[PDB]
Fold:
Amino acid sequence: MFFIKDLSLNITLHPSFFGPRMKQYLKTKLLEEVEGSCTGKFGYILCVLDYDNIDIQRGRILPTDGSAEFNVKYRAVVFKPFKGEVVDGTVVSCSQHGFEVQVGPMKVFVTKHLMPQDLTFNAGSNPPSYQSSEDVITIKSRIRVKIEGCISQVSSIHAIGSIKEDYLGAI
Amino acid sequence: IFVYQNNITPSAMKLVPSIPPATIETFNEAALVVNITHHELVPKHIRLSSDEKRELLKRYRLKESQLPRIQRADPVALYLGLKRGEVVKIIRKSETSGRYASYRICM
Amino acid sequence: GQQYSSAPLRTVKEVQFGLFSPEEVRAISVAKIRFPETMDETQTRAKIGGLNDPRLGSIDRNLKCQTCQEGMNECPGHFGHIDLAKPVFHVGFIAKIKKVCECVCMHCGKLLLDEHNELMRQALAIKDSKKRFAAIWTLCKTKMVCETDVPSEDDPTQLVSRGGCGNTQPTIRKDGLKLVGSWKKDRATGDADEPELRVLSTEEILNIFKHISVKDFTSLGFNEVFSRPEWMILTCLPVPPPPVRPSISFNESQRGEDDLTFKLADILKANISLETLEHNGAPHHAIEEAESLLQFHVATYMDNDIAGQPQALQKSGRPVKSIRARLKGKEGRIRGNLMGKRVDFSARTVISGDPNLELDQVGVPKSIAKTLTYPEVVTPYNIDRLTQLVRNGPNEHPGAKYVIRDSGDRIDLRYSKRAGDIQLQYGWKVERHIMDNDPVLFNRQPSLHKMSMMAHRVKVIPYSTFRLNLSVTSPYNADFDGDEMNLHVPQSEETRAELSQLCAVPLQIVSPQSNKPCMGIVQDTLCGIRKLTLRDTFIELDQVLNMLYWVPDWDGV
Amino acid sequence: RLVKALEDIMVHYDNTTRNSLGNVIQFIYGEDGMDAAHIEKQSLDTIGGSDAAFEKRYRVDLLNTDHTLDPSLLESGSEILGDLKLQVLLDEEYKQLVKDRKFLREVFVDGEANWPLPVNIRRIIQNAQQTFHIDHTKPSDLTIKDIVLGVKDLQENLLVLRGKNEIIQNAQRDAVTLFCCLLRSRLATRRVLQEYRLTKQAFDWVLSNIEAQFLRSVVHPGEMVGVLAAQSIGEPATQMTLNTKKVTSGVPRLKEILNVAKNMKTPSLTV
Amino acid sequence: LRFGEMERDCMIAHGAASFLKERLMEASDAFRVHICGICGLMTVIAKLNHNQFECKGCDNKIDIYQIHIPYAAKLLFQELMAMNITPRLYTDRSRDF
Amino acid sequence: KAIPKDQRATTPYMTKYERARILGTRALQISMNAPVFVDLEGETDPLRIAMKELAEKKIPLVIRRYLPDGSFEDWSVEELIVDL
Amino acid sequence: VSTSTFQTRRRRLKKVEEEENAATLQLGQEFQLKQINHQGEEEELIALNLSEARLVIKEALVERRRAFKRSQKKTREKELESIDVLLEQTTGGNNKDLKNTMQYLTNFSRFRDQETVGAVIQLLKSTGLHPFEVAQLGSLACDTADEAKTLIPSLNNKISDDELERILKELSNLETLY
Amino acid sequence: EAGRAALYKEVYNVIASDGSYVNYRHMALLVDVMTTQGGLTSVTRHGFNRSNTGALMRCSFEETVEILFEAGASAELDDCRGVSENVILGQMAPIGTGAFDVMIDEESLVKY
DNA sequence: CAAGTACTTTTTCCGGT
RNA sequence: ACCAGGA
DNA sequence: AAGTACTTG
Ligand SMILES: Nc1ncnc2c1ncn2[C@@H]1O[C@H](COP(=O)(O)CP(=O)(O)OP(=O)(O)O)[C@@H](O)[C@H]1O
Ligand SMILES: [Mg+2]
Ligand SMILES: [Zn+2]
Ligand SMILES: [Zn+2]
Ligand SMILES: [Zn+2]
Structure:
């Protein structure tokens, strides 16, 4: 995945900023509002591309107030995960319920029951782990999880994933 | 054009649209005694070509709706044998400009 | 004011009319609306989970809304619903409901005529939905039989089957809120003499309507998304929130319920009877009795000024105020609350003419200036002026009433402990008194003119009247026999410009109504001009010098 | 009713008169594209009088020893006599002035000369006379070409409609038709030289002023002429009441009119 | 003071578009409703504090606007809805012309 | 579809309404502490500052003239003739 | 106020179906193959492989520093420390999302240099596979065509096992070291 | 065309009966409005208010509810081009000052 | 094809029982 | 709300 | 009430 999606955003500047550092304050305001943000629709809007050529266009002056509205058009690198998406990630936390794995900007969590049977939760370790007949999944471990489904929420997207199927698991 | 003295039976009147692309016009002789077009209040109405009409509409950025309308049944529309959708250019004298050009689309 | 919402602010570009589908009513609804009892949880002052706030709006101004948290001035009321025990005709639509019945087959829901008929295909051709439905109805009314097979688009010998159903169509007539048909009959070729006379049930019509084809109703006036014909028959009734029907709540433990709140409770009461009646041992006539009762209340809630006499008057003899009548013109929503409004920054007094005022000015009493305010934003150019106006306060003439911080809050210079200690920052508004030379809209009703409302220059003066130049009398049609005039103060630089630049008195001098000036020299000045401009009239040096000094633009020559 | 009927009508940026549907009511506002405020009851001289008197006014014949402009009217006068090329210009001038006379006489059948029109030409001339201290004795620094051609050019600059195509450019001519009829009658060669007695500079200023004054005189796109008309018809009807053949007259007849009353009170013919 | 129809009519004759707006809005009525982008009604259960928006019956927790209309218009609309008519308000346009 | 500058066909002069709206807008911005593009030659009023800015044609505003069909002509204040 | 697109769809009243997203290559309405760039042109969807991705963000942020210091006029773990430093200059910091992503990319990138990523992009962008498959094939380390056809089920009938295996062999070759 | 000329003649004859004068154009507009649609559209609820303008607009004169009721039943879509609709919507109408839009051009802003 | 019904509105703004 | 008034 | 538009005989 990790797409490049062309997008726009309406910004309402106040008359006080109608100085020649116009494009500047707008491009900056755009970067504040959009970068690091996360919606469900486009996912994680991570990094705005081609600052030098960010299109301001003309801004219409809103009638009974002074402020002007510009539809800033722009291109950005986004991250929307999907169900069926297979992702290589690093483990973060690990409870008796399962292990949450950091995959880019988002965390995919694996249920104890979404893991192969042989993998058993070992409480007695610093830090807590999952022990197989020959394998060990703990805090710093690298994994490959299949995303079973997502939950688009607030300023994030979290998801449940499996390591049950073939070619999935620790690396 | 079929000029009739007194009447045409609702019987014979059924044959009127029977032979297209050719068209038929029923005219009561008694109406034609005086030419209406010649009157004080009747300005030069002019039939437009499909090209002239295409131009009128293009030049004023109009939909056929937006244009003033001449009734199909209209005495001048009849005299000219206006067909639904045909535009007429009306040239009238103005106390304001001297000469004002108007347009009416058929109905 | 009203709080900040992160929602993008836009304008209404299009208004898409339609009809509430019963499923939408039940979806949008935040409560159902089971009890005719207003509130008082068994006398215990608070709302009942039945009528007015079973999640709805909010009665108590000191109580936040149950659905949205916001409360009173922020919270638009939230809708509810009542599932009607039996479907009912929507008063407004009884008209169309009949004409639609008159157009369709009362058994299969097929259009009585179709593309096979030449006059029909012609009317089906009409582009306008209203004119098309008009031309359809006039043709389809007369077709008293749903045709099984119609003569084909060639010979009458070999006829092609269109839609089925042989069935005779009723001769529908309205019996006030009721629709009753008279099916032709066939009996031994002739008969009628004496046909089948029966009332068409709401539910039977509903079902026939349901079966009208998407192509068919779209050929009729209708649209498959926003207005299906089935949506003219009310199944689920939307319950307007308190804001629509406010309880004019006098004292503490004392009611004041709105007309609509009672009218709904009637509908509720009328329904619960009809409901329990059919769930119980249905006496089948006591059923069509309690049904017709509910059909009436649901009719008389929306419209009470119905043709068929019963005026559904409140027990006081006073007729119930229908929603229809709230919206009906000149005094009433559209014409009275929206096309015109009662407004703030408006002032009115007795007018009197002054020869010592300039044409474009308007004598304004000090009281009126100390009252009327202009919101001026703290800028470096006015920072010091404004701090003095603020210092002067609400009572000195060149003073101010309020100080508005960026912090959204209003300071009352009249009570604030900091009314002296006040230190203005750029970007704050100061609600100052009207000052000399401020542009104001001045007007005299009737107002048959562009000219009857002109922008003037303020001139604060003593004595309780509006003073105006005598020449400016003519456009307003004012005299000083006890006439009063209104003043409106603009609230922003944007609108001050509008007044000064477009509607100032000097601009209005030459009238387009008649291509001539609509202001001249009148009365004392006109009578005295003739007298002075005579060949007999001569002025001695003494007077002649004052005569000169009096012209403020005099060359000194 | 008059307001509610017209409200939505205004002048859009193409001088068109349209309602909320963009439906064309008038092609050009009030048939001329002018603002009612910038119009005065000016007189179209050309209209009436004897055909004989019209000749005496507008006719200049450099080919006749008597009918030429006397060299007291202009410096050229002496060297102008019998110029065949120049007399062609004066022949166009007079032939166009005659065309005008006939045209006006069709438009205003009764010969009513006084018609409200933009730009007060009379006043502009008067002002040139007191501005330039026009000595009614000394001959002018004007050529026939200075006048004849000058007016021809001034007309090309009296812009109502702007579009670069036949339809609009014809609509432009049509909109300006009667104003020029006036302009030509008032600015004819003999009239300028013998009556007004203008210098080249004076005349040059009279032209620019007519032009500027003309351009101001046009309607402004945005003007709500719907409500304007409604009130301009309406207000007089209200003072036809509020203040102090026998055909249905006044207020009830206006009622009859708007209502399009079929069964009218005093129906009549004028045979 | 009543700024009546006649009074509105002069303001329109003048072409004082903003001054008219001001009178009818800031100087009188003016309210802020939250409208849905799907079914153009005042359906939004806006908890503008928690920034929660929602129009259940549309499951729309996203495509929501805010408009400034005279409080009497907010009324009209609710009164028309109470009478079964949907006066759907949209911020985009489809038609053209 | 937005008419191109070389095909513009409206008045080259600034309509009474345009004038008033620009003056009002500028005055609304100047008053809202916007940057003044002229030399305040001792001016305290934002409308007078707007007039001053307009006379020197140093107003950064563009009038979008909508035609009845929807299309528009963009005109700068700097280019519009001010006969008013 | 939130972010708008270029996908216009006039959804009047008609709410839902919104048919679930998968590896039936049924991504969003937004993440359609026939997507449309703002300059009017209809351009095919852009999916990046972790590294094809890393190189974009790096480049964009580097060019940003250039423009930020234009207005201000008037080895893997060593690549990671330097990135956190470039970010410290061009980003908002509050954007932990990008720092988190930058570390992820830096760690899990399969191809170090633009020269390499160029050749990778060429190889896969010839298979006629859908933008997503191409990206997944670039960022997921598979050996058997089965590993690939199992992890990228969308491929299942779209390519020869042998042909896919040829690609996989040539990806293993381009694969830069650590 | 003759009906229009007669109509003006007749309207003008009433205004001029009182003695008073009204510039042509005004009367010409009323006359032209009653004309355009094909025949004689009356200045009554059966005339202009029956034409295909805005639903909210028409409703604001004479048949208020009846109008909004049929608007509902036939799923009418209001353009919102009429003065009336904007007043009802509390928005700046496209009248004079509202007949255009205002924009800041950055390039000219940085130029000054 | 005619008489008879069901329809709709009628200027603006500004103290008391 | 009706009644009474004012221009 | 007055006028019309619209059905109904
Ligand atoms: N009922 C009413 N409705 C509307 N306007 C009215 C009105 N009564 C009075 N007016 C206004 O006031 C004027 C009438 O004033 P009146 O008090 O009747 C004395 P008059 O006999 O008209 O003498 P005058 O106008 O020479 O001073 C009208 O021209 C009108 O604008
Ligand atoms: Mg008086
Ligand atoms: Zn609430
Ligand atoms: Zn049938
Ligand atoms: Zn919704």
